[PDB]
Design a protein around this ligand. Structure first.
Ligand SMILES: CS(=O)(=O)c1ccc(N2CCNCC2)cc1
Lengths: 39, 156
C-alpha cells in the first residue's frame, strides 16, 4: 500500500551545484517503455 | 490528504521498514509520477486515496486524480535543474546541461546524473521553475554510466 509524503517546493535554486556531461546518443524505445542504445 | 503543489516521495511499507520506491509532482490537484514507480496502483495521502486517472507504459508515465497537467518543454539550449529527492535524503537541486537522445521519432533531452532507483519521478525544471519532465527512465552507456531521458507527458 503506497503512500506519499511532501518533500519540498518546486523552485529553481540560484548557484546550485553544477555537474553532469551532455551526451548525444542514438537510442531506441520499445513497447515496454525500455530505452536501448542503437549501434 | 495533502494536495499542496510540490514534490513528494512515494513510499511503501510492504518491504523491510519504510522504503522509498520513487518520487512525484503535485500540480493543479493532479499527482504525476513514472509508471514503473507505482505500476498504476492506487496511492494514499494521509487518510485520503489517490486513484489512477491516465497512464501509459511506453511513455512510462501515470497521473492520479486528473489528467496530466505538465506541459513545459526543454528549450534545447539551456541548463536545467534536477530536483533530486533521494531515499532518506533532503531534496537537492543539481544543475546540468542536457544531452540528447536521438530516436527514429525525434529527439528528446537527456540528463547524465546517477541517483538511486527510488529517485525515479524526481522533476527536471527550467529556469522559471516549470517542470519540463521527470527523471528515471533511461539507459546505461558504454563506460557504465546512467543517462535519463527528460520524460514529459501531453496536456490534453
Ligand atoms: C526505479 S528503477 O531504477 O529500478 C527502474 C525500474 C524499471 C524501469 N522501467 C523503465 C520503463 N519500462 C519498465 C522498466 C526503470 C527504472
Amino acid at each position: 500500500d503506497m503512500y506519499i509524503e511532501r518533500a519540498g517546493d518546486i523552485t529553481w535554486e540560484k548557484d546550485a551545484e553544477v555537474t553532469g556531461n551532455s551526451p548525444r546518443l542514438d537510442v531506441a524505445l520499445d513497447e515496454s517503455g525500455d530505452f536501448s542504445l542503437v549501434e | 490528504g495533502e494536495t499542496t503543489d510540490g514534490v513528494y516521495r512515494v513510499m511503501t511499507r510492504r518491504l523491510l521498514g519504510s522504503t522509498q520506491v520513487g518520487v512525484g509532482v503535485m500540480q493543479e490537484g493532479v499527482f504525476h509520477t513514472m509508471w514503473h514507480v507505482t505500476k498504476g496502483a492506487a496511492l494514499r495521502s494521509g487518510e485520503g486515496r489517490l486513484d489512477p486517472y491516465w497512464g501509459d507504459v511506453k511513455q512510462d508515465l501515470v497521473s492520479y486524480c486528473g489528467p496530466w497537467k505538465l506541459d513545459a518543454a526543454w528549450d534545447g539550449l539551456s541548463e536545467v535543474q534536477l530536483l533530486a529527492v533521494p531515499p532518506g535524503e533532503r531534496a537537492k537541486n543539481i544543475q546540468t546541461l542536457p544531452g540528447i537522445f536521438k530516436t527514429k521519432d525525434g529527439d528528446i533531452g537527456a540528463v547524465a546524473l546517477d541517483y538511486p532507483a527510488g529517485t525515479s519521478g524526481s522533476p527536471i525544471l527550467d529556469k522559471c521553475g516549470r517542470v519540463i519532465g521527470l527523471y528515471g527512465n533511461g539507459v546505461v552507456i558504454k563506460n557504465g554510466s546512467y543517462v535519463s531521458a527528460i520524460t514529459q507527458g501531453k496536456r490534453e
